[PDB]
């Protein structure tokens, strides 16, 4: 073969084979992890079930995450101050102080905001003049009309603790930073020696249309229903029934062409409050066609099967049900059993004996 | 009832723009281009093959040196390739794992990534530390970001899930200008070769042309029946390509402010994913849900080529900066290049 190619190639192809070895090894987390989708309409129900299935963590104050949230708490402070100076600029008449050198000296650090590491004595020394200036708070109360980070006023009063070099913030400041509004609240744990990821939606858009196809090769999808919702008011239309919209969107999931092999797991997470409310508010509001009985323990199963029979033309979708639970260890044990059922089914399918 | 009076005046102004559109219409392009010369039969072979992935492929991007190619996974990887030598030069992980778009720098130093979690990330390659560092972050949008492009090495334009677009500067981490005016969610965008105008396409059958520095809705383009999923720009800076869910890709012109020509092959019901031009301005390269790509002539109004070398649905395609080659990425966990 060739020689002059090999000199530069002992960097090039060495890099390619090394990065190929670094890329192929992801099967340790690619195939060992089994993806679960979460969806429903009971938001507090969702939060309670996800906090119960999560193993109860405390990892906000570790010494390995230290510099990470340090960079976060630095970035938030500089973002907030440049945002409020942008707001002061967008105030149509200038409002500074008598000695206007504070607003001009701010431009030294607005141009000097091109660092990521440790905070300078210069930036602290100029923001201690900026927050001392009463104009920034005169516009900052008015900054609600504009885009504004809500955690602004906390650090800019407590800037002296920030100004100490080599200081470590606490769990409280971290938990003040790490609350996010919209996106994916992707949590994950490992139960019964199997790893599990858990994704969600927080009503990002009006209707789902595009991003559902991104979650294609998902082994399980978990729908949740707070079953004491028939009498609760859908306050976006004259149709009071909150149940029917959730049923319709559930029906749009079950007839989705991307989902013809993905099992569903159905939750009933508000039955205990239903068990007392059934007396005052029975089945006389939800449906006028249940002429069977009045009591809770059979009407619950009836509404379960009346939920279940919307599966259009499929005997390959294994709809699994549950009820509420106080100690959710058996609950997560049940969902463990369900997911291992569907994966052993998939395993014997791939083996070719069913 | 002043809202009804102003929407009456809105209706009559829509009547005025359609009056001006019918008035400035004299003769369509087809009868003027009845006497043009046909090209004939043009075949493309897959030159080199790229098979370094696991999950599906959502987006790719050519450089501005015809040397490097960028491509996004869906398993939390992001890989760049050399074009000629076909070696995996760099491949980075990221903290999220639901990405939907990339953009490479016109210089060749910055690479941008983003996706479902409403945050954009920019990375730096040319460092003294000998490894890629997580460099900069963009956050502020509500909905997921659709597509992003570089117009500079400092200023980045992007398109959100809240029916908006925005111009940011990477040193601040604050958006410079916000572009509101769309009604449906924006899906794709592209900018002019002169870096002065960009056009956004939503799911609401309308295309908005924006001047980058003014921040006013300069031009609107109605006519469609459904979502726009593909935008490409003409190399002169006068025309603009579209695409929709039933292969009804329509040509527009920004100077004359009017529809040019709709395209429709009689055996196609499938959707569009992304469209691309050539250096000539006589070629439209596009892909459909039946795995098929085909070159459509701009002036002749019809050709049904075949280069359907994908088992799964085609996802993204592009033309090179010099127009030498073209690149195709689909959900087969592969990446192919035609010439």
């Amino acid at each position: 073969m060739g020689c002059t190619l090999s000199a530069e190639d002992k960097a090039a192809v060495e890099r390619s084979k090394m990065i190929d070895r670094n890329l192929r090894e992801d099967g340790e987390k690619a195939a060992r992890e089994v993806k679960l989708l979460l969806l429903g309409a009971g938001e507090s129900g969702k939060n309670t079930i996800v906090k119960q299935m999560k193993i109860i963590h405390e990892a906000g104050y570790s010494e390995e995450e230290c510099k990470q949230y340090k960079a976060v708490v630095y970035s938030n402070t500089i973002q907030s101050i440049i945002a409020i100076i942008r707001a002061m600029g967008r105030l149509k008449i200038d409002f500074g102080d008598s000695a206007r050198a504070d607003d001009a000296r701010q431009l030294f650090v607005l141009a000097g905001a091109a660092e990521e590491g440790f905070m300078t004595a210069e930036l602290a020394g100029v923001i201690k003049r900026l927050w001392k200036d009463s104009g920034v708070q005169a516009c900052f109360n008015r900054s609600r009309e504009y885009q504004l980070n809500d955690s602004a006023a906390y650090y800019l009063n407590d800037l002296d603790r920030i100004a100490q070099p080599n200081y470590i913030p606490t769990q409280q400041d971290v938990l003040r930073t790490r609350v996010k509004t919209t996106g994916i609240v992707e949590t994950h744990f490992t139960f019964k020696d199997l790893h599990f990821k858990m994704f969600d939606v927080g009503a990002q858009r009006s209707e789902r249309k595009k991003w559902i196809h991104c979650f294609e090769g998902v082994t399980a999808i978990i729908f949740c229903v707070a079953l004491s919702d028939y009498d609760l008011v859908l306050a976006e239309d004259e149709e009071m029934n909150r149940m029917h919209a959730s049923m319709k969107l559930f029906d749009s999931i079950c007839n989705n062409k991307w989902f013809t092999d993905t099992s569903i797991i159905l939750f009933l997470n508000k039955k205990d409050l239903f068990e007392e409310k059934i007396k005052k508010s029975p089945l006389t509001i939800c449906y006028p066609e249940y002429a069977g009985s009045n009591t809770y323990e059979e009407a619950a199963a009836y509404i379960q099967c009346q939920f279940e029979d919307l599966n259009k033309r499929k005997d390959t979708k294994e709809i699994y049900t549950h009820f509420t639970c106080s100690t959710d260890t058996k609950n997560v044990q049940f969902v463990f059993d369900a997911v291992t059922d569907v994966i052993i089914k998939n395993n014997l399918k791939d083996c070719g004996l069913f | 009832s002043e809202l009804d009076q102003l929407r009456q005046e809105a209706e009559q102004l829509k009547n005025q723009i359609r009056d001006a559109r019918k008035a400035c219409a004299d003769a369509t392009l087809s009868q003027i281009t009845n006497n043009i010369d046909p090209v004939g039969r043009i075949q493309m072979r897959t030159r080199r093959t790229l098979r370094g992935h696991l999950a599906k492929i959502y987006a790719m991007h050519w450089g501005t040196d015809s040397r490097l190619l960028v491509s996004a996974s869906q398993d939390g990887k992001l890989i760049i390739w050399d074009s000629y030598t076909t070696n995996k030069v760099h491949a980075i992980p990221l903290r999220s794992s639901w990405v939907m778009t990339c953009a490479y720098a016109p210089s060749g130093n910055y690479v941008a990534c983003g996706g479902l979690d409403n945050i954009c990330s920019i990375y730096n390659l040319k460092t003294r530390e000998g490894n890629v560092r997580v460099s900069r972050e963009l956050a502020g949008h509500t909905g997921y970001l659709s597509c992003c492009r570089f117009l500079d090495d400092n200023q980045i334009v992007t398109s959100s899930g809240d029916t908006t677009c925005a111009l940011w500067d990477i040193e601040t981490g604050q958006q410079t200008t916000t572009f509101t005016g769309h009604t449906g969610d924006v899906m794709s965008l592209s900018l002019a070769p002169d870096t002065r105008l960009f056009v956004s396409g939503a799911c609401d059958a309308s295309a908005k042309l924006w001047d980058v520095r003014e921040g006013m809705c300069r031009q609107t383009f109605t006519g469609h029946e459904s979502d726009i999923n593909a935008i490409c720009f003409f190399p002169n800076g006068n025309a603009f390509a579209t695409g929709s869910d039933d292969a009804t890709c329509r040509l527009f012109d920004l100077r004359a402010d009017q529809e040019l020509m709709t395209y429709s092959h009689d055996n196609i019901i499938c959707g569009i994913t992304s469209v691309s031009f050539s250096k000539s301005g006589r070629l439209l390269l596009a892909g459909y849900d039946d795995f098929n790509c085909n070159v459509w002539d701009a002036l002749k109004a019809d050709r049904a080529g075949v280069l359907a070398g994908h088992d799964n649905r085609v996802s993204c395609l592009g033309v090179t900066d010099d127009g030498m080659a073209v690149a195709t990425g689909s959900w087969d966990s592969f990446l192919k290049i035609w010439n």
Partner: antibody, heavy 126, light 104 residues
């Protein structure tokens, strides 16, 4: 949009003269005016930079303290006076625009550099 | 607060590279200028990245740590002048020594 200058010549070394630079076409208060000299056969050395925002200006690394700058808020014109002469004052002078704060004139992107220049005056000694 | 250029030359139909290294870890306020002999200094690039509107797009400005680079790709023979760098981070304004171009 252009500029203009005046006040070139020669006086015996030690005294001062009036050097004028007029900017035209835009706002005066929403920018800063820079002064720079150039020596025959040499490079470029900075002289002065007056901010209309605060007025807390400064001068060069060596020639500071002995010159005096001014710029009027109405006529939009800068005037410079230069005592304490030496052999290295034989030079062609220029003035230029620098938008420090980019937002007050219009909410815009940033810009770092001298934007618009003149043709420059010339002063010598003997 | 000083810097270091690289004095060099060029020829026609080439791509030329101009380097600049500042003394301290300076921020991203770097400008580039062109000067025809005995004439006005015209700006090329402001903020080390974006070119000025109107100048042809055969020039570009690169930043790498504390190093700055002017890149001219496939010049035209109407470019015979002297180029200059400029630091503008602080309120203390400076320049480079600068270099010129001359063919064989």
């Amino acid at each position: 949009v252009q500029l203009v200058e005046s006040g070139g010549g020669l006086v015996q070394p030690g005294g001062s003269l009036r050097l004028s630079c007029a900017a035209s076409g835009f706002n005066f208060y929403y920018s800063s005016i820079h002064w720079v000299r150039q020596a025959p056969g040499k490079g470029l050395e900075w002289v002065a930079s007056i901010y209309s925002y605060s007025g807390s200006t400064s001068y060069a690394d060596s020639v500071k303290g002995r010159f005096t700058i001014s710029a009027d808020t109405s006529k939009n014109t800068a005037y410079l006076q230069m005592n304490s002469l030496r052999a290295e004052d034989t030079a062609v002078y220029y003035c230029a625009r620098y938008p420090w704060y980019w937002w007050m004139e219009k909410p815009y992107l940033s810009l770092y550099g001298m934007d618009y220049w003149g043709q420059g005056t010339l002063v010598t000694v003997s | 607060m000083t810097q270091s250029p690289s004095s060099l030359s060029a020829s026609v139909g080439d791509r030329v590279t101009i380097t600049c290294r500042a003394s301290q870890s300076v921020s991203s306020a770097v400008a580039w200028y062109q000067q025809k002999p005995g004439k006005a200094p015209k700006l090329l690039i402001y903020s080390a990245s974006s070119l000025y509107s109107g100048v042809p797009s055969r020039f570009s400005g690169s930043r790498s740590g504390t190093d700055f680079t002017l890149t001219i790709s496939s010049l035209q023979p109407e470019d015979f002048a002297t180029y200059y760098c400029q630091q503008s981070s602080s309120s203390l304004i400076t320049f480079g020594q600068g270099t010129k171009v001359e063919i064989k």
